[PDB]
Amino acid sequence: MSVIKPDMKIKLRMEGAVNGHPFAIEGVGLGKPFEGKQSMDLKVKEGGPLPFAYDILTMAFNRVFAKYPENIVDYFKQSFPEGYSWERSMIYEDGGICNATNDITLDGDCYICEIRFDGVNFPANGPVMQKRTVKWELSTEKLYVRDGVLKSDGNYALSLEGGGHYRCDFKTTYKAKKVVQLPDYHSVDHHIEIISHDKDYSNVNLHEHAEAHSE
Fold it and tell me: Domain residues of the chain, as ranges?
């Protein structure tokens, strides 16, 4: 590509609410699309200090940053410069459900992301509202085509303070803004990690690494 470069920038804004309570976060970041790595600094702009586990937001904060091998069609890199959007549900085992959308465009060497996030029905004594989450385990996303667009599923898990896990099922639809070649069924393994943060998570540094496989 002369559109996808080895080093790219990111600018993002999330507006949302969790159990009815509104917030907004802005981010700037740097990524390496062919290496499948990115890093971003995130700042709470409205609705802080956030009254819920930051971990529920991190996978909403772009599969253009995934190392695709030569033998798997890369839906995401193909979609540029026009870009793509996604829509996602996240169904937690204790009944909390989050919906989110992202619209991703490209300006020069900077992806621009506009995210909406809405979470409801998190129990007041659950790990989200009590901030008892530690980190996401390594995740495997499974991607398949349906109705001319790309769909994906994952069975993800947060490790909890004091041990044990909290499970969440992610279901996503990715929609390219132009006709692109559609991929065969494949996987993406992801690792996401909050590298640093201040006391109430008003400032967070987040890293992600992703690699595709079909082997």
Answer: 1-215
In contact, 172 and 88? CB cutoff 8 Å: yes
Give me 105's structure tokens.
């465009």
Identify which of 116, 115, 117, 166 has the alpha carbon closest to the alpha carbon of residue 137.
Answer: 166
Helix (H) or strand (E) holding 200: none
Phi, psi (5° rounding) for residue 167?
-100, 145
Q: How many Cβ atoms from other residues are within 10 Å of residue 36's Cβ?
A: 22
Q: How far apart are CA 23 and CA 39, in angstroms?
A: 22
- Experimental technique, in short, is X-ray
Rounded distance, CA 153 to CA 140, Å? 9
DSSP state of 78: H
Element (DSSP H or E) covering residue 77 = helix 75-78
Q: What angle do CA 205, 210, 212 make, to 5 degrees?
A: 170
Residue linked to tokens 């994906």: 152
CATH of domain 1-215: 2.40.155.10
- In the block, tokens 């079909």 appear at 214
Q: What gap in Å lies between CA 152 and CA 51, rounded to an integer?
A: 29
Beta bridge partners of 16: 23, 117
Distance, CA of 204 to CA of 61 (rounded, Å): 11
